[PDB]
Design a protein around this ligand. Structure first.
Ligand SMILES: *[C@@H]1O[C@H](CO)[C@@H](O[C@@H]2O[C@H](CO)[C@@H](O)[C@H](O)[C@H]2NC(C)=O)[C@H](O)[C@H]1NC(C)=O
Ligand SMILES: *[C@@H]1O[C@H](CO)[C@@H](O[C@@H]2O[C@H](CO)[C@@H](O)[C@H](O)[C@H]2NC(C)=O)[C@H](O)[C@H]1NC(C)=O
Ligand SMILES: *[C@@H]1O[C@H](CO)[C@@H](O[C@@H]2O[C@H](CO)[C@@H](O)[C@H](O)[C@H]2NC(C)=O)[C@H](O)[C@H]1NC(C)=O
Ligand SMILES: *[C@@H]1O[C@H](CO)[C@@H](O[C@@H]2O[C@H](CO)[C@@H](O)[C@H](O)[C@H]2NC(C)=O)[C@H](O)[C@H]1NC(C)=O
Ligand SMILES: *[C@@H]1O[C@H](CO)[C@@H](O[C@@H]2O[C@H](CO)[C@@H](O)[C@H](O)[C@H]2NC(C)=O)[C@H](O)[C@H]1NC(C)=O
Ligand SMILES: *[C@@H]1O[C@H](CO)[C@@H](O[C@@H]2O[C@H](CO)[C@@H](O)[C@H](O)[C@H]2NC(C)=O)[C@H](O)[C@H]1NC(C)=O
Ligand SMILES: *[C@@H]1O[C@H](CO)[C@@H](O[C@@H]2O[C@H](CO)[C@@H](O)[C@H](O)[C@H]2NC(C)=O)[C@H](O)[C@H]1NC(C)=O
Ligand code: NAG
Lengths: 268, 133, 50, 197, 35
C-alpha cells in the first residue's frame, strides 16, 4: 500500500496473509544465524599458539593470524576477502561479527597444531609436531621410520605447496564461484521484486495517488483491488523462492559442519 | 546506540560474559537490572607446547549423553469441495469449470502420508527377529 | 506534479541543463530540481523499522 | 526434572497445529465480496449477481488451500531429511562401533541405546573420556649400539631419570625391550634421538 | 473440522516399543554380530 489508508482498509478484508510471510522470513533469518553458529563454534576454549615457533621445520606463517592488521586475519583470509566483493525492505546484521569468526578459526587451528586430535575429545594434550606427523603416517599404513628419515624433504614439499596455493588464489580469478553465485542470485531476486512495483496489472495506472485523484471512490476501489492482487501474488512468489533457496543453503551448511568435525578434529 | 539500532532501558557495561539473549552485531543482554555487553567467545588458555614434552592421561570417565531426532509428522487429508463450497449445488457447478484442481491437491497429501509411513518403517524396522533378554 | 514523501537535503550531483529529476535504479526517484531556484535536492525516505 | 529439553518435537507439533488453525480461520474473510457466508449471498441477490459475488469467495479459498499445500510439501521434505539422518545413526552407532569423530557422542564412542518418542527417537550415547593428565619428557627414537630403535606401538617417556614405553591413551610404563621395538638404520639422520640401553 | 481429516499411523506405538526392545536386547546379548 505505501501510506494509503483506503488501501489498508481494503487489504484488511483479505484475512491474515502477510503475517505468514513475516513468520517465514523470520524463520529464515533465525536459521541463518543457527547455521553459522553451528558450523563454527566447535570449541570450548580459545587456544593460543606459543610465541616461539619451531614446528620441526614446517612453516605456518601464511595461515596464522597477523597481529599487525586490526582485523587479526591471516594472509590467505585477507586474499579471500579482497577477491570477492527502498519500500519497506530491510537487511539485518548477522549475530557473529567476522572478527569472532576469525577468532574461532584461529583457536581451532592453534589447537590442531599444538595438540593433534586430542582436544576434540577432552582436554588438549601437547605433542611435538613431528611425533604427530609420525602418528598420522602410521594411520595410513606407513611406518613412522619413513617420516623420521625424510623430515626435511617432507617439510620442504609442504612449504612449497602452501606457497603455491597463495599464488593460485591471487592470480586466477573466478575461484570463489559459489559464494558469488549466491550473492548474485539474492540480489537479482530482490531487484526483480522491487521492479514489479511498476506494473499496471490491467488497471488504469500504477500510482495510487493518481487513481485516487482521478476517479470516484466506488470506481477507484476496483483499480485498487486489481493492483493489490498482483502485488500480493508477486510477494508470494518471492517468499516461496526464498524458502527453497534457504533449504538448499541449510543442506550445504550441514555438510560443511560434518567436514569440519571429521577432517579437522581427526583423521578420516 | 548500537550497530543493530537504538536500545532503551538497559545499562551498558565494559565486562564480557556468555550470550543470554542475542541482540546482534556481536552484542547481547542479560539480567542482574538489564545490562548489555559484547559477547565473550570463551575462556582463554595457552597450551604448554615444547618440542620434547608430552602429556598422558592417567585416569578416565564414562559419559552418557542424549540426542533427539524427529522422524514423522501427522498425516492429514482434505476434501476440497466440502471445504470450498460446503453443501451448495450452485457453488459446486461454478467450481466445476475450473478444470482439474482437486486431484492435484490430493495426490500431494497422499504422497506425504505414504512418505511418513515409509520414514517410520525405515528408521525402526531393522531386525529380522524379535530378540528377548 | 511529481508527488512523494520523504526528507529533502542538499546534494552535489550535476544535472545537465535539461533534466528535471533523476532515479538511481529500479526506477525510484532520488533527486529533483526545484522549478524556481534551479538547484538539486536529494530525497531520503522517512525512517522506519521494527 | 528439567523441562524444555524436547524442543524439536514440540516445535513440529506446534507448527502443524498452527497451520491447520490458520487454514480453518481463513474461512471468515470477504475477499472483496459482500459477506463471508454463502446462504446470505444466495438469499439476498439474483443469480446474475450471486455468481459474481460467489466467484471471489471461490478464488480466495482456492488460493489459501494452495498455500497450505505448498507449506506442507516444504515441511515434509525437511522431515524426510531428518528421518534419513536418524536411520543412518541407528544403523551405524547402534549396530556397530563408529570411528568417525563426533558423529554420535562427544569423545571416543563405546556404544549406544535407542528409545522411542511420540514422533521421534532418542539415542543414549556411551563414550569414554580421558582425565588426570601429567607432564613427561619424550624422544622419537633410541640409539643403542649404533642402531636406532622405534616403538612397535606406543611412545617413549621418562620420569626424569629412566625411560619407558607406554600406550598412547593410558599411562602404563614398561621396560624398553627388544620385543616392543624395531630397528632401522643407524642413529645419524634422526633429529632428537637419545642415548639409552 | 470442515472437510479435513487426520489419518492414524500404520504402526501403533506398542509395535515401536517392541522394536526398540528387540534392538536393545540384541545389542546387549550378542554385541554387534546380530547386525
Ligand atoms: C615462512 O615463510 C615466510 C614466507 O611467506 C617467510 O617470510 C619471509 O622471510 C624472509 C626472511 O626474513 C623475507 O626476506 C621475506 O620477505 C619473507 N616473506 C614474506 C612474505 O614476508 C618466513 O621467514 C618463513 N619462516 C621461517 C621460520 O623461515
Ligand atoms: C606442564 O608444564 C608446564 C610448564 O612448566 C606447567 O606450567 C604451565 O605452563 C603453561 C605454559 O608455560 C602455562 O600456560 C600454565 O599456566 C602453566 N601452569 C601453571 C603455572 O600452573 C604445567 O602446569 C605442567 N602441567 C600440565 C598438566 O600442563
Ligand atoms: C580415577 O577416578 C576415580 C573416580 O574419580 C577414582 O575413584 C575414586 O577414588 C577415591 C579415593 O580412592 C574415592 O574416594 C572415590 O569414591 C572414588 N570414586 C568412585 C566413583 O569410585 C580413582 O581413584 C581414580 N584413579 C586413580 C589412579 O587416581
Ligand atoms: C523567479 O522569480 C524570483 C523572484 O525575482 C527570482 O528570485 C530572484 O532572482 C534574482 C535574479 O538575479 C536574484 O537576484 C534574487 O536574489 C532572487 N531572489 C531570491 C532568491 O529570493 C528567481 O530567480 C526566479 N526564478 C527563475 C528565474 O528561474
Ligand atoms: C622414575 O621411575 C623409576 C622406576 O620406578 C624410579 O626408580 C625406582 O625408584 C624407587 C623409589 O624411588 C626405588 O625403590 C627403586 O629401586 C628405583 N628403581 C631403580 C631401577 O632405580 C625413579 O626413582 C623415578 N624417578 C623419579 C624422579 O620419579
Ligand atoms: C628443541 O628445542 C631445544 C630448545 O630450543 C633445542 O635445543 C637447542 O639445541 C641446539 C643444538 O643442540 C643448541 O645449540 C641450543 O643451545 C639448544 N637450546 C638451548 C636453549 O639450549 C633442540 O635442538 C630442539 N630439538 C630437539 C630437542 O630435537
Ligand atoms: C651417545 O653415545 C655416542 C657414543 O657413546 C656418543 O658419540 C660420541 O660423541 C662424542 C662427542 O659428540 C665424540 O667425542 C665421540 O667420538 C662419539 N663416539 C662415537 C662412538 O661416535 C654420542 O655423543 C652420545 N649422544 C649424546 C647426545 O651425547
Ligand atoms: C566503561 O564504559 C563506559 C561507557 O559504558 C566508557 O565510557 C568507558 O570508556 C569504559 N571504560 C572505563 C575504564 O570506564
Amino acid at each position: 500500500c505505501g501510506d494509503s489508508t483506503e488501501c489498508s482498509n481494503l487489504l484488511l478484508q483479505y484475512g491474515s496473509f502477510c503475517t505468514q510471510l513475516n513468520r517465514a522470513l523470520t524463520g529464515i533469518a533465525v536459521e541463518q544465524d543457527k547455521n553459522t553458529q553451528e558450523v563454527f563454534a566447535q570449541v570450548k576454549q580459545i587456544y593460543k599458539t606459543p610465541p616461539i615457533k619451531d614446528f620441526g621445520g614446517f612453516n605456518f606463517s601464511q595461515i596464522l593470524p597477523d597481529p599487525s592488521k586490526p582485523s587479526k586475519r591471516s594472509f590467505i583470509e585477507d586474499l579471500l576477502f579482497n577477491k570477492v566483493t527502498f519500500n519497506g525492505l530491510t537487511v539485518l546484521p548477522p549475530l557473529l561479527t567476522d572478527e569472532m569468526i576469525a577468532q574461532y578459526t584461529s583457536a581451532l587451528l592453534a589447537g590442531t597444531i599444538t595438540s593433534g586430535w586430542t582436544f576434540g575429545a577432552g582436554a588438549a594434550l601437547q605433542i611435538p609436531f613431528a611425533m604427530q606427523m609420525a602418528y598420522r603416517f602410521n594411520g595410513i599404513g606407513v611406518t613412522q621410520n619413513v617420516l623420521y628419515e625424510n623430515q626435511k624433504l617432507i617439510a620442504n614439499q609442504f612449504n612449497s605447496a602452501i606457497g603455491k596455493i597463495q599464488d593460485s588464489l591471487s592470480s586466477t580469478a573466478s575461484a570463489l564461484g559459489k559464494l558469488q553465485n549466491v550473492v548474485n542470485q539474492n540480489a537479482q531476486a530482490l531487484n526483480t521484486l522491487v521492479k514489479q512495483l511498476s506494473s499496471n496489472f490491467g488497471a488504469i495506472s500504477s500510482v495510487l495517488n493518481d487513481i485516487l485523484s482521478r476517479l470516484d471512490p466506488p470506481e477507484a476501489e476496483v483499480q485498487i483491488d486489481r493492483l493489490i492482487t498482483g502485488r500480493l501474488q508477486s510477494l508470494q512468489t518471492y517468499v516461496t523462492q526464498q524458502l527453497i533457496r534457504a533449504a538448499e543453503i541449510r543442506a550445504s551448511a550441514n555438510l560443511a559442519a560434518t567436514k569440519m568435525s571429521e577432517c579437522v578434529l581427526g583423521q578420516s | 546506540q548500537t550497530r543493530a539500532g537504538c536500545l532503551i532501558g538497559a545499562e551498558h557495561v565494559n565486562n564480557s560474559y556468555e550470550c543470554d539473549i542475542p541482540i546482534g552485531a556481536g552484542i547481547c543482554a542479560s539480567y542482574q537490572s538489564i545490562i548489555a555487553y559484547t559477547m565473550s567467545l570463551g575462556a582463554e588458555n595457552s597450551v604448554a607446547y615444547s618440542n620434547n614434552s608430552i602429556a598422558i592421561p592417567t585416569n578416565f570417565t564414562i559419559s552418557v549423553t542424549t540426542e533427539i531426532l524427529p522422524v514423522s509428522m501427522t498425516k492429514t487429508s482434505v476434501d476440497c469441495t466440502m471445504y470450498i463450497c460446503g453443501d451448495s449445488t450452485e457453488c459446486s457447478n461454478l467450481l466445476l469449470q475450473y478444470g482439474s484442481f482437486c486431484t492435484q491437491l490430493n495426490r500431494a497429501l497422499t504422497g506425504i502420508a505414504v512418505e511418513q509411513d515409509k520414514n517410520t518403517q525405515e528408521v525402526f524396522a531393522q531386525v529380522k527377529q524379535i530378540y528377548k533378554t | 506534479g511529481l508527488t512523494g514523501t520523504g526528507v529533502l537535503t542538499e546534494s552535489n550531483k550535476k544535472f545537465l541543463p535539461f533534466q528535471q529529476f533523476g532515479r538511481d535504479i529500479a526506477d525510484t526517484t532520488d533527486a529533483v530540481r526545484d522549478p524556481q531556484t534551479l538547484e538539486i535536492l536529494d530525497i531520503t525516505p522517512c525512517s522506519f523499522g521494527g | 526434572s528439567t523441562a524444555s529439553a524436547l524442543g524439536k518435537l514440540q516445535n513440529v507439533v506446534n507448527q502443524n497445529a498452527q497451520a491447520l488453525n490458520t487454514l480453518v480461520k481463513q474461512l471468515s474473510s470477504n475477499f472483496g465480496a459482500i459477506s463471508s457466508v454463502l446462504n446470505d449471498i444466495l438469499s439476498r441477490l439474483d443469480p446474475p449477481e450471486a455468481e459474481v459475488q460467489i466467484d471471489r469467495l471461490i478464488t480466495g479459498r482456492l488460493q489459501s488451500l494452495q498455500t497450505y499445500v505448498t507449506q506442507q510439501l516444504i515441511r515434509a521434505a525437511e522431515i524426510r531429511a531428518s528421518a534419513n539422518l536418524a536411520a543412518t545413526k541407528m544403523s551405524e552407532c547402534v549396530l556397530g562401533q563408529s570411528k568417525r569423530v563426533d558423529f554420535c557422542g562427544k569423545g571416543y564412542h563405546l556404544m549406544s541405546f535407542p528409545q522411542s518418542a511420540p514422533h521421534g527417537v532418542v539415542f543414549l550415547h556411551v563414550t569414554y573420556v580421558p582425565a588426570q593428565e601429567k607432564n613427561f619428557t619424550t624422544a622419537p627414537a633410541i640409539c643403542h649400539d649404533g642402531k636406532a630403535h622405534f616403538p612397535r606401538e606406543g611412545v617413549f617417556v621418562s620420569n626424569g631419570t629412566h625411560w619407558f614405553v607406554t600406550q598412547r591413551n593410558f599411562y602404563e610404563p614398561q621396560i624398553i625391550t627388544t620385543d616392543n621395538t624395531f630397528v632401522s638404520g643407524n642413529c645419524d639422520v634422526v633429529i632428537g634421538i637419545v642415548n639409552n640401553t
